[PDB]
Write a protein that binds this ligand. Sequence first.
Ligand SMILES: [Ca+2]
Ligand SMILES: [Ca+2]
Ligand SMILES: [Ca+2]
Ligand SMILES: [Ca+2]
Ligand SMILES: [Mg+2]
Length: 1054
Amino acid sequence: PQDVVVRLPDVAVPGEAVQASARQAVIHLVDIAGITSSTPADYATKNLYLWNNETCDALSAPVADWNDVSTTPTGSDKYGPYWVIPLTKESGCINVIVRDGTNKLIDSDLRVSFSDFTDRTVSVIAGNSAVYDSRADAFRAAFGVALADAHWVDKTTLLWPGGENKPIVRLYYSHSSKVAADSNGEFSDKYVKLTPTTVNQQVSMRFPHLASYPAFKLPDDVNVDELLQGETVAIAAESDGILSSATQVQTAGVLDDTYAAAAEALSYGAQLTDSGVTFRVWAPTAQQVELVIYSADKKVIASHPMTRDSASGAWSWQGGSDLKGAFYRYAMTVYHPQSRKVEQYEVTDPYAHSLSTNSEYSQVVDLNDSALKPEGWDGLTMPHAQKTKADLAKMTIHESHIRDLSAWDQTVPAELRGKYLALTAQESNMVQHLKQLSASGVTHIELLPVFDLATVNEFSDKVADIQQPFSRLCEVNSAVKSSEFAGYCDSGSTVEEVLTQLKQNDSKDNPQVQALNTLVAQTDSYNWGYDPFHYTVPEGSYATDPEGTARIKEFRTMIQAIKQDLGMNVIMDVVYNHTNAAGPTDRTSVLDKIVPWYYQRLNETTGSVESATCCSDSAPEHRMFAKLIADSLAVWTTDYKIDGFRFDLMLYHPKAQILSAWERIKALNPDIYFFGEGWDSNQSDRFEIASQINLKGTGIGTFSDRLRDAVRGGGPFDSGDALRQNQGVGSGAGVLPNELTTLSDDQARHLADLTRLGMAGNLADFVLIDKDGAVKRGSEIDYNGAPGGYAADPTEVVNYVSKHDNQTLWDMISYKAAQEADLDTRVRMQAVSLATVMLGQGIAFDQQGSELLRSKSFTRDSYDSGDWFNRVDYSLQDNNYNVGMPRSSDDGSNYDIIARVKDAVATPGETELKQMTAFYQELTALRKSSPLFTLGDGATVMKRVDFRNTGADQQTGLLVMTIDDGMQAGASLDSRVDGIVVAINAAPESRTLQDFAGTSLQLSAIQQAAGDRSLASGVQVAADGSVTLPAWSVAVLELPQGESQGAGLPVSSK
Ligand SMILES: [Ca+2]
Ligand SMILES: [Ca+2]
Ligand SMILES: [Ca+2]
Ligand SMILES: [Ca+2]
Ligand SMILES: [Mg+2]
């Protein structure tokens, strides 16, 4: 109360010096440094550099010379100088650099658009790149709250660059209004005073990315709880109280430091107890939280102020058991820093376990009700074991989507198409096909998002799908009436029929199938679904009824049909790395409405929600989102009997957080498998990321992109001719070049190093002979500058050559195969490509439909390309190749290479699909045919797995792997063989192996049984034990085991 008062400068908010007249523009430079009076600093040395180019041309007399200082102010007053600037027209823009001498005062090349500011009278500030409509706007920005680069990281620490070595540094706070200079131009709100200090070790451990920040300390007795109830602003002033800066404050650090210990010990959601129903939501900053109860028809029937727990920041209320089945939301009164208002809105439960249609209301549910279980649910067992590393290694995954599975299948009842329940249609083509894949050794179905997505409208009246009349499309899609396809609104045919008609004159110059599908996408039922609305409710649109609990039992019914009828385990894709939206207004913003700025990751400076994932990046590094994630997985594990989880963008999570969720979930079922994908994240400055490298030895799997790229050819950024030039091992790199490629023998040999290493589990320490005949460890094989091998156990590696994202395997082969490769050869290229995965030691993963040569008509990113481009035809008429040019916005620069390559051979038909399916089941039956294929343990792999045909003189494209079951490896794991040879001859020539002469090698039984339909058809094992391999073939051979264990195929010490 003896304190210096922080205040604005004792001047009025400036008006405008001059308003531009006709064919003029005007620019003010607001001399804020000067208005902080003392010196009337002269403006002669101030000048404008001005020029025309092709974008902004409106200047009338540019002075192109850079060193000409002559463009000095037209005039000036106490707030600074201004410039009158002649122009050619009033519609356009002009380029401006602001200078003192030749020195830039604003580094950014400024541009003033006459579209934005129609009075072409604008203002700018030295050191700021923004262009304001008036000097008042600029003045208020300079002395107003801006950005959010202050971080209240624990109870008594504030990191803020803006306060560095200023004499006055304060935390201002206002419960009910936003902090602002009052009528006196003074900041009269309450404040805490901050004194300079040095960051803790514990704070630098928590926020390494902020450890260079100037630190400040809060009095030890500050009432933290009360400050976090409203707006908080950090302010810095000079010794006379004139404000230097004010910024908003990011509070997630202090929120964990104050509440997370207590709040972690509580359970959340609408919880059926024995004494009724307990509701609890975490809202440590909220002013009020009322529980609103809704009737079935969504009328308010009760509203309860909840009880705040002071230690946790959680709010709770207990009601009657009759509340089971009731709809509810939380009515929040809470300050949101993005809008700087105390907001009032109703939000669904982030811990919701049941919802109304389209997620508008959460719903009280007891998932343990036998009425939400199909008959026998409680005794449902894992058909495949996941205990030992060898168990895990046998995992053979079929990555599928709910509509991809059943949308086009006429043999699924119509009401079940695109539905969880399609999986119960035991006579359908789709289900019978999955049953046979299971019998042959596909072990796992992996589901694309079946949690509650945001992007499909669950109100069936608001949706039109291609099996329905075009008129319905025009009814629900207002853009169709004013499109080139409007005439079809009265046509009388379905949208699928119209798309069929559009194929005929579809081409790179008339991409009309795509053009119509783009509109169909906006309002169909189709999406991959990587758009989280609620993390722990099934998706509503995949139920026959999305209103209420029905989806819970239909979902479990599907889980039962997969494990029990189909005999496969079930993996869920999960997307904890982002939310669909944030802020206080978006319909699908849930977490960020209830605890604002806590669950999203924000830029350290502006406080904007980062979007590096695509969308609204979440903050799994914060304790209560880590809890939300683990609690969520727990429900999917226990109540839905999910056997494994695949994390989208896992490397946006801290390694420690993934490992913590894993230990928590292993406590419920120790056999649950975790894995994820990651290639992009640069969150390394904030924490140790859950990456391929950092996860060595943890037992968390990661998708490997090493064998993928090497066998497909190229990489995901390829476009244009590179898509054809970058051939892979599967499409003839080196051995069957196409007319565009320049791949050298050395490059092709490098691809074979990557593939072999992946077949041995992509281990860091696996020793192999490289392309030049040198000894190398896996970590020493280059993958675009990084260590290639990175795992400790093959169970940490998921191999694949096709997946839902990027082009299907078949479309890649169509891009890259030489013209002379005929259709039958392309089918074998598909099979040899998949043999490197299926016969490798890594866990085997594949896209639903590779066994049908699945195509997407070259679409590279089909997440919103509808039933049309994602079609899988289980009646086996074709593979959905050549059904139209793909989406132009993403594949348009590829139209030239598509048109060139597309019609090289005929489109696969029933004969090729059935042949591929046999190839596929052969490969999966081989993979599970001996324990040697799935050793599980890295040290065992290194002990037993070797390769022949290596070095600079290798026969290009021939992969020969040996797996030892003989004396030098230890126990005999397979009673019937002393060893196994895997020979993949991905080449146009027949090849002969002398490596095994004299050993009584013989072709495996499975392949001999397949006969002329085998991948090994035509293989010759001669008397002397030499082996002839046909072009484009896969052979699995074995050393038969005698009365006891033999010499097998010992690995050589290199
Ligand atoms: Ca103006
Ligand atoms: Ca949904
Ligand atoms: Ca869509
Ligand atoms: Ca044996
Ligand atoms: Mg960053």
